[PDB]
Amino acid sequence: GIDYDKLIVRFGSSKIDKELINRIERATGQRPHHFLRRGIFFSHRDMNQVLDAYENKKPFYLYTGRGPSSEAMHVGHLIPFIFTKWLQDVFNVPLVIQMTDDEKYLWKDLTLDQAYSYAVENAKDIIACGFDINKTFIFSDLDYMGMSSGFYKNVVKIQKHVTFNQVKGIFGFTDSDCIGKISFPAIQAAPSFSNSFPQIFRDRTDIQCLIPCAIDQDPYFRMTRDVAPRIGYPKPALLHSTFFPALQGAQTKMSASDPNSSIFLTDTAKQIKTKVNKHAFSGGRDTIEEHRQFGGNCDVDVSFMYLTFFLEDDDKLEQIRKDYTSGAMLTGELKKALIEVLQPLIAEHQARRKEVTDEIVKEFMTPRKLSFD
Amino acid sequence: GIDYDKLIVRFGSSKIDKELINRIERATGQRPHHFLRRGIFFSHRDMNQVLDAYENKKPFYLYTGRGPSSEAMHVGHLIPFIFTKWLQDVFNVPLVIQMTDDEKYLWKDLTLDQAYSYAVENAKDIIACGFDINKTFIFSDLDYMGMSSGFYKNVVKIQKHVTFNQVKGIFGFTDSDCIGKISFPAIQAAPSFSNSFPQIFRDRTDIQCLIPCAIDQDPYFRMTRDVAPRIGYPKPALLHSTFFPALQGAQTKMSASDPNSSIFLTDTAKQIKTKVNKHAFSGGRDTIEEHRQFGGNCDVDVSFMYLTFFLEDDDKLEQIRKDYTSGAMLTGELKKALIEVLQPLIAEHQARRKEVTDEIVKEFMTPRKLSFD
RNA sequence: GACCUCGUGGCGCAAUGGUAGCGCGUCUGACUCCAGAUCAGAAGGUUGCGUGUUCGAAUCACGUCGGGGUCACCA
RNA sequence: GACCUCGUGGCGCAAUGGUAGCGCGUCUGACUCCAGAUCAGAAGGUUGCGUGUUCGAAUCACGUCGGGGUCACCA
Ligand SMILES: N[C@@H](Cc1c[nH]c2ccccc12)C(=O)O
Ligand SMILES: N[C@@H](Cc1c[nH]c2ccccc12)C(=O)O
């Protein structure tokens, strides 16, 4: 697989150890999410400060985002939201969700309308995760920028403090890139500062922000944490997640363009079954006999990784890990287990997504005061 | 002085000749402004198309701007506004005025509040020029960006179509510059496209824009005219003005930082007199005798240039030019003439500026439908 | 996060025993119808801060703030 | 505005008489508990457009659209 620990050291973040997980527990009076228990969210930045502040009755809000690449969203896009939804319940803090429709516009061969529409469409799947209408504000960059008295002002503050060389270094842009991409980083940094949401944080500028996200988003936030001090703001705390494995393997890349690259949120029970059996990479031995003797390799087995993300029952997961690893369970039954887990899951999502009306999306996307300001 | 014709050829613009001036006359049933008659506004881009459209009952709006460097504005900052105010009367079109408070923020050692305040303050002097409350919208970038459904969208369209190398070339930025300056050009291009003012141009995207401005602003608009086609919009037409001379000479640079660099809009009758006599560069001969024989040089004489901008009476101006040039009038009386012209002028401005209430500024700066949409 | 580099008289820049210079400026007097050139002089908060090392420090160390640059192509 | 450069099979790239290649992919069959490696083959809108120059053109000229680059430091 990939060296997450070496990644941690490389970037400079911190490993989420037991003391931290226990702290989260002690701080929420609730069992830490399996993503934490199982290592899915393994890295962090300043989480203890978040915890210290929280335990000391000081506010903090969650900030996470989504790049509306298309109307197609797969099971892997949900991880950070599934986690953030949990975080919101467990800490009871307000949440801000950024739809970078303007980023996709700058990057994909998309039109502002398509981009925006994708933002709005994805918002349905995000909302379907169960976020609290009263304490979460989903917003598209294209919309919010033009209707906020604090957001642009921060983008500008942030931009006066980030040179091209910096982004060139952090993101690897080039003089050949459009000035849109060159400065986009500030747009993603901006929601890390509460006064970008005047209508919800009462012009306050010191509310602690916690950004749960996939490890590959860290560069934006390392840059953010870097300008924050320079512009009189606190730096956002982070909770990093690992990469969701593509069906072809942890190494390989997945995308809404290749349908057999992952289980998409629209897939049917049948497609769920087909995709796993016909595409989930395996760690199981070639012949059913070699497997029995050597046991399967759960480290590279995409189906087990999947279960690791969605089989909530700790004990059940272990049975599988144990029997698969020993050879007692052939990768065929493993994949069979993953399908009985995914089918009811994707179904449920499609269900609650449908219950998301236009007025509900409209609300979520409307800037307003939020329950716990 | 400076080679404006060579500038015209360099840039690629067009010289405003008699046929054009006469066209403007024939098109407005009114005598073309002295800035046109005397060469102050000497260059243009597509003015005939503006005229063709206008004469053919097709709409066009004016767009001009101001960089709120400070609360201090001198007589030279007024030229493009004095002209634009005339253009508005004479063509009866709506006008849009951009206060680039975010540009000064990025460039000067200013704070967002100072920047914004300067924008609002300058708006008073601009408004004092007599623009029509019903057909002109003065706006600060810092404000409008956060309260417009079309402006940011265009900045983004414009940014996806302008590479760093381009601006590097056009403005000479460097990898060392902040991403804020790198992409600022799009912000100044954006008001060249009517749909940036949805609340006034009814989401229309083909209304002809005419940008009166100082020749040194052309680079922004050459870049604009360049992306316009690529993003399905018409390119802005231009009317270029020459540089207002600094008191130390046409060559030398002037700035709100050096008070004796020009006559400021707040100056007193006495200061007007003092500054001219004690600082206006001259083209008059050394000794009062050499002057009589050789006559003065009106080409480099800052005081005459001044009269050229503010002595509206064509005949009177000629008398001065004639007598000064022959030696009949010593530069002392010339400067005396310029002072009797400037004093009542600056006074009048200070007068009508005072009549500009906060509610009047507030109105001008409020995005709304405009008389002639 | 780490490291590197710079941080000056109003701005742009200079490694002690004589006169620490003005690119550029400001200011006063003279000459000129005026402005400028010129000539004659005058003035301006010196070292980002905080400790410390030496007989002495802007020139050294530590810490700190700020500008800039830099770290397994890429979000 | 001018000039330069590129523009391909789903993407990344190649200057005719034999077999226009696959970096990479897609797809079918076989073998495997499944996925992958492997083996065996199948398919995909070829030249951004529009004219034109030659017996023939993706390889030339003109025009055009689009990506990129470039022109008296600087708005
Ligand atoms: N760029 C992210 C979107 C995003 C914007 N802001 C964020 C903050 C946290 C995590 C992700 C985001 C994506 O492509 O999905
Ligand atoms: N940059 C210009 C301000 C400006 C913005 N948009 C404009 C359009 C036309 C002329 C000037 C402007 C200045 O410094 O004064």
DSSP B213-261: EEGGGHHHHHHHHHHHHHTT-PPPEEEEE-PPPBTTBSSS---TT-GGG
Distance (Å) of CA B132 to CA A174, A343, B95, B96: 46, 66, 9, 11
Beta bridge partner(s), residue B209 = B61
**3-state SS string for B1-50:** CCCHHHHHHHHCCEECCHHHHHHHHHHHCCCCCHHHHCCCEEEEECHHHH
Residue of B145, B157, B183 lying closest to A183 (CB–CB): B183
Closest residue by C-alpha to C1' distance, nucleotide C33: B288
DSSP helix, strand, coil percent of chain A (3-state; round to 5): 55, 10, 35
Task: Mark whether A241 and A279 lie in a shared domain.
Answer: no
Tell me which H or E stretch contains A60.
strand A60-66
Q: Residue B338 and residue A38: Cα distance in Å, rounded?
A: 83
> Of the candidates B353, B346, B354, B348, which has an alpha carbon nearest to the alpha carbon of residue B276?
B346
Number of neighbouring beta carbons within 10 Å of residue A90: 17
Q: Which strands sit side by side in the sheet containing A41-45, from one edge to the other?
A: A14-15, A41-45, A237-241, A208-214, A60-66, A95-99, A136-140
- A177–B163: do the CB atoms touch at under 8 Å? yes
- B176–A165: do the CB atoms touch at under 8 Å? yes
> Cβ(B126)–Cβ(B137) under 8 Å?
no
Beta bridge partner(s), residue A62 = A95, A210
Measured between CA atoms, how close is B194 to chain A, in angstroms? 16
Resolution (A): 3.0
Query: In whole angstroms, what separates CA B56 from the centre of its chain?
Result: 27
Helix B314-326 / helix B331-354 crossing angle, nearest 10 deg: 150
Alpha helices in A62-137, H assignment, sequence order: 79-91, 101-107, 112-127
Among chain A residues 235 through 274, which have CB within 7 angstroms of nucleic chain D?
248, 260
**Rounded-to-10 torsion of CA A220, A226, A227, A231:** 140
Task: Mark whether B342 and B265 lie in a shared domain.
Answer: yes
For A246, left (φ over 0), alpha (ψ -120 to 50), or beta? beta
Task: Mark whether B83 and B211 lie in a shared domain.
Answer: yes
**Count of alpha carbons within 13 Å of A323, Cβ hemisphere only?**
13
Q: Residue B23 and residue B350: Cα distance in Å, rounded?
A: 35
> Cβ(B144)–Cβ(B196) under 8 Å?
no
Is residue B180's beta carbon less than 7 angstroms from any atom in nucleic acid strand D?
no
- Helix, strand or coil for residue B306? helix
Is residue B331's beta carbon less than 7 angstroms from any atom in nucleic acid strand C?
yes
Amino acid at B7: L
Of A218, A238, A254, which one is at a domain's C-terminal end? A254
Q: Residue B217 and residue B242: Cα distance in Å, rounded?
A: 11
Q: Residue B158 and residue B193: Cα distance in Å, rounded?
A: 10
- From the CA of A184, the nearest ligand is 1
Residue of A102, A153, A179 lying closest to B186 (CB–CB): A179
Find which nucleotide's C1' atom is closest to A11's CA: C1
> Of the candidates A142, A132, A161, which has an alpha carbon nearest to the alpha carbon of residue A98?
A142
Beta bridge partner(s), residue B140 = B99
> Of the candidates B326, B333, B318, which has an alpha carbon nearest to the alpha carbon of residue B293?
B326
Distance (Å) of CA B41 to CA B47, B95, B188, B311: 12, 18, 21, 16
Q: Residue B20 and residue B49: Cα distance in Å, rounded?
A: 11
> Of the candidates B294, B296, B279, which has an alpha carbon nearest to the alpha carbon of residue B245?
B279
Ligand 2 centroid vs B82 CA: distance in angstroms? 15
> Cβ(B103)–Cβ(B188) under 8 Å?
yes
Separation in Å: D26 C1' and A245 CA: 21
- A163–B177: do the CB atoms touch at under 8 Å? yes
> Of the candidates A102, A280, A310, A87, which has an alpha carbon nearest to the alpha carbon of residue A186?
A102
CATH classification of the domain holding A144: 3.40.50.620
| Exposure b/e, B319-347, CB count within 10 A at least 16 = b | ebbebbbebebbbeebbbbbbebbbebbe
Q: Which strands sit side by side in the sheet containing B41-45, from one edge to the other?
A: B14-15, B41-45, B237-241, B208-214, B60-66, B95-99, B136-140
> Cβ(B281)–Cβ(B248) under 8 Å?
yes
Distance (Å) of CA A202 to CA A199, A205, A247, A371, A373: 6, 9, 45, 13, 8
Q: Residue A303 and residue A316: Cα distance in Å, rounded?
A: 15
Q: Residue B293 and residue B238: Cα distance in Å, rounded?
A: 43
Among chain B residues 125 through 154, which have CB within 7 angstroms of nucleic chain D?
none
**Sign of CA pseudo-dihedral B143, B146, B147, B150:** positive
- DSSP class of residue A357 equals -
Ligand 2 centroid vs B301 CA: distance in angstroms? 28
- Best of B74, B192, B220 to mutate for ligand 2, by most ligand atoms within 8 A of CB? B220
> Of the candidates A175, A205, A210, which has an alpha carbon nearest to the alpha carbon of residue A96?
A210
Residue minimizing CA distance to atom 9 of ligand 1: A64
Ligand 1 centroid vs B221 CA: distance in angstroms? 34
Q: Residue A97 and residue A99: Cα distance in Å, rounded?
A: 7
User: What is the bridge-based pairing of β-strands B41-45 and A60-66?
Assistant: unpaired
With beta carbons under 8 A apart, name residues in chain B contacting A106: 156, 159-160
Residue A292 belongs to what domain range?
A: 255-373
Of B192, B223, B254, which one is at a domain's C-terminal end? B254
- From the CA of A192, the nearest ligand is 1
Tell me which H or E stretch contains B276.
helix B269-279
Separation in Å: C23 C1' and B246 CA: 22
> Cβ(B219)–Cβ(B171) under 8 Å?
yes
Task: Mark whether B179 and B208 lie in a shared domain.
Answer: yes
Distance (Å) of CA B113 to CA A67, A70, A195, B143: 32, 39, 15, 11
**Cβ contacts of A188 within 8 Å, gap of 6 or more:** A65, A98, A100, A103, A220, A224
> Of the candidates A152, A88, A116, which has an alpha carbon nearest to the alpha carbon of residue B155?
A152
> Cβ(B240)–Cβ(B41) under 8 Å?
yes
Q: Residue A174 and residue B353: Cα distance in Å, rounded?
A: 48
**Sign of CA pseudo-dihedral A346, A348, A354, A358:** negative
First-to-last alpha carbon distance for chain B, in angstroms, is: 42
Measured between CA atoms, how close is B111 to chain A, in angstroms? 9
> Cβ(A185)–Cβ(A212) under 8 Å?
no
- Helix, strand or coil for residue A354? helix
Q: Residue A212 and residue B81: Cα distance in Å, rounded?
A: 50
Q: How was this structure determined?
A: X-ray
Query: In whole angstroms, what separates CA B103 from the centre of its chain?
Result: 17
- DSSP class of residue A32 equals P
Amino acid at A360: I
**Count of alpha carbons within 13 Å of B315, Cβ hemisphere only?**
0
> Of the candidates B189, B173, B71, B182, which has an alpha carbon nearest to the alpha carbon of residue B141?
B189
**Sign of CA pseudo-dihedral B198, B204, B205, B210:** negative
> Cβ(A219)–Cβ(A238) under 8 Å?
no
List the beta strands (DSSP E) in A158-263: 208-214, 237-241
Task: Mark whether B74 and B156 lie in a shared domain.
Answer: yes
Task: Mark whether B348 and B244 lie in a shared domain.
Answer: no
Say how many residues make up chain A.
373
Residue of B148, B150, B164 lying closest to A179 (CB–CB): B164
Task: Mark whether A67 and A80 lie in a shared domain.
Answer: yes
Task: Mark whether A183 and A96 lie in a shared domain.
Answer: yes
> Cβ(B124)–Cβ(B91) under 8 Å?
no
Task: Mark whether A185 and A59 lie in a shared domain.
Answer: yes
Task: Mark whether A305 and A213 lie in a shared domain.
Answer: no
Residue of A nearest to B109 (CA): A160
Measured between CA atoms, how close is A155 to chain B, in angstroms? 9
Amino acid at A282: S
Among chain A residues 279 through 318, which have CB within 7 angstroms of nucleic chain D?
279-282, 284-289, 291, 296
List the beta strands (DSSP E) in A190-259: 208-214, 237-241
> Cβ(B180)–Cβ(B141) under 8 Å?
no
Q: Residue A119 and residue A65: Cα distance in Å, rounded?
A: 11
> Cβ(B254)–Cβ(B261) under 8 Å?
yes
Number of domains in chain B: 2
- Best of B61, B100, B101, B110 to mutate for ligand 2, by most ligand atoms within 8 A of CB? B100
Tokens representing residue B286 in the block: 């050394």
Query: In whole angstroms, what separates CA A202 from the centre of its chain?
Result: 27
Q: Residue B256 and residue B203: Cα distance in Å, rounded?
A: 38
Beta bridge partner(s), residue A136 = A95
**Cβ contacts of A9 within 8 Å, gap of 6 or more:** none
Please give the radius of gyration of chain B, using alpha carbons only, rounded to the nearest integer. Answer: 21
Q: Residue B360 and residue B253: Cα distance in Å, rounded?
A: 34
Is residue A172's beta carbon less than 7 angstroms from any atom in nucleic acid strand C?
yes
Question: Please, is A338 exposed, middle or buried when counting C-beta atoms within 10 Å of its C-beta (0-12, 13-18, 19+)?
Answer: buried
Residue with structure tokens 């527990």? A25
Among chain A residues 193 through 222, which have CB within 7 angstroms of nucleic chain D?
none
The DSSP line for B50-103 is HHHHHHTT--EEEEEEE----S--BTTTSHHHHHHHHHHHHH---EEEEE-HHH
With beta carbons under 8 A apart, name residues in chain A contacting B163: 175-179
| B179, B203, B233: best to mutate for the A interface, most A CBs within 10 A | B179
Q: Residue B181 and residue B90: Cα distance in Å, rounded?
A: 36
Task: Mark whether B290 and B330 lie in a shared domain.
Answer: yes
Residue of A nearest to B145 (CA): A146
| A100, A154, A156: best to mutate for the B interface, most B CBs within 10 A | A156
Q: Residue A213 and residue A80: Cα distance in Å, rounded?
A: 6
Distance (Å) of CA B297 to CA B35, B251, B319, B320, B334: 21, 15, 15, 12, 12
Residue with structure tokens 């759960």? A298
**Count of alpha carbons within 13 Å of A358, Cβ hemisphere only?**
1
| Exposure b/e, A1-33, CB count within 10 A at least 16 = b | eeebeebbeebebbebeeebbebbeebbeeebb
Task: Mark whether A267 and A247 lie in a shared domain.
Answer: no
Query: In whole angstroms, what separates CA B154 from the centre of its chain?
Result: 23
- Helix, strand or coil for residue A364? helix
> Cβ(B37)–Cβ(B29) under 8 Å?
no
User: What is the bridge-based pairing of β-strands A237-241 and A208-214?
Assistant: parallel
Beta bridge partner(s), residue A249 = A246
> Of the candidates B39, B308, B341, which has an alpha carbon nearest to the alpha carbon of residue B333?
B341
Beta bridge partner(s), residue A6 = none
Distance (Å) of CA B317 to CA B69, B250, B284: 33, 19, 17
Q: Residue A156 and residue A172: Cα distance in Å, rounded?
A: 21
> Of the candidates B373, B369, B364, B370, which has an alpha carbon nearest to the alpha carbon of residue B66?
B364
Tokens representing residue B47 in the block: 């003015």
Residue of B146, B147, B160 lying closest to A180 (CB–CB): B160
CATH classification of the domain holding B267: 1.10.240.10
Beta bridge partner(s), residue B246 = B249
Beta bridge partner(s), residue A241 = A41, A214
Of A230, A254, A278, which one is at a domain's C-terminal end? A254
The DSSP line for B309-373 is HH---HHHHHHHHHHHHHTSS-HHHHHHHHHHHHHHHHHHHHHHHHT--HHHHHHHTS----S--
Separation in Å: C16 C1' and A230 CA: 38
- B160–A105: do the CB atoms touch at under 8 Å? yes
Number of neighbouring beta carbons within 10 Å of residue B199: 17
First-to-last alpha carbon distance for chain A, in angstroms, is: 42
**3-state SS string for B114-183:** HHHHHHHHHHHHHHCCCCCCCCEEEEEHHHHHCECCCHHHHHHHHHCCCEHHHHHHHHCCCCCCEHHHHH
Pocket around ligand 1 at a 6 A CB cut-off: A 63-67, 98, 100, 103, 188, 211, 213, 217
